[PDB]
Design a protein around this ligand. Structure first.
Ligand SMILES: *[C@@H]1O[C@H](CO)[C@@H](O)[C@H](O)[C@H]1NC(C)=O
Lengths: 40, 29
């Protein structure tokens, strides 16, 4: 492949994607749908 | 990488996938 081809990194690391799924999940468990409509 | 020319005339340069031995200076991933 090493002849003109390159792969760029994603903007969010898999550690940062897992911090988002954690925050969505922790909001969902502690506050229901309310964190989608406003403050948790 | 540009602040916008209306903001400032400075720039930073990224050499994509290049180790800094080959080119402030900083090794990003
Ligand atoms: C860059 O070069 C240094 C010294 O040869 C090496 O330790 C490092 O693993 C290389 N790669 C990156 C991505 O820094």
């Amino acid at each position: 492949k090493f002849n003109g081809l390159t792969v760029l990194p994603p903007l969010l690391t898999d550690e940062m994607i897992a911090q988002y799924t954690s925050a969505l999940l922790a909001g969902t468990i502690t506050s229901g749908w309310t964190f989608g409509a406003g403050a948790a | 990488i540009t602040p916008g020319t209306n903001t400032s005339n400075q720039v930073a340069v990224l050499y994509q996938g290049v180790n800094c031995t080959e080119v402030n200076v900083f090794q990003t991933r």
